[PDB]
Design a protein around this ligand. Structure first.
Ligand SMILES: Nc1nc2c(ncn2[C@@H]2O[C@H](COP(=O)(O)OP(=O)(O)NP(=O)(O)O)[C@@H](O)[C@H]2O)c(=O)[nH]1
Ligand SMILES: [Mg+2]
Length: 166
């Protein structure tokens, strides 16, 4: 069947795994568990299409700058995640996008900007800001919460639809 190779990238601790786990196991992981490299395969019916979501959950730590080129090269769609309460994670975003473009020799790669942890009150990154960024990249922006599950499916399915169009 149609497989979609999605990769979740972003700075450490922004909630890449939490998002993935919510989509897969439908439950919020509230524990410190740094990722080295994890893979998840889930069958889903999206817009009537039976497909396999092959998701690669990556590490936020730079010590693994090598494993990057590999998966970035084989990925079809990328969820670029940052946390709305971590300005730094928002700034690192462009670096991940740039690495993706250089590794694939393409300026138009299926991507979605995701502002996670939208359930917290101490927001340091204005929504219009991330949205302005997304607008310049020509990619969709979606705020999510792995805790309450808001936008979770929204983010993954939009990416999938972005892949269908390209
Ligand atoms: N309040 C709140 N906490 C969240 C949310 N998503 C993740 N967290 C919390 O943030 C911490 C880090 O989440 P985790 O999924 O491990 O982040 P990561 O981006 O995957 N980290 P790493 O890059 O090291 O692999 C955890 O304690 C987790 O519960 C969210 O939407 N809301
Ligand atoms: Mg993780």
């Amino acid at each position: 069947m149609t497989e979609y190779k999605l990769v979740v990238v972003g700075a450490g601790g922004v909630g890449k795994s939490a998002l993935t786990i919510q989509l897969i196991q439908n439950h919020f992981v509230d524990e410190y568990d740094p990722t080295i490299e994890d893979s998840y395969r889930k069958q889903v019916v999206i817009d009537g299409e039976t497909c396999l979501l092959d998701i690669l959950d990556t590490a936020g730590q730079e010590e693994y700058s090598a494993m990057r080129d590999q998966y970035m090269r084989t990925g079809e769609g990328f969820l670029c995640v940052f946390a709305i309460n971590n300005t730094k994670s928002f700034e690192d975003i462009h670096q991940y996008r740039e690495q993706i473009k250089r590794v694939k020799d393409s300026d138009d790669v299926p991507m979605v900007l995701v502002g996670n942890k939208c359930d917290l009150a101490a927001r340091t990154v204005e929504s219009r800001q991330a949205q302005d960024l997304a607008r310049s990249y020509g990619i969709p922006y979606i705020e999510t919460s792995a805790k309450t599950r808001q936008g979770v499916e929204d983010a993954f399915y939009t990416l999938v639809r972005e892949i269908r169009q390209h």
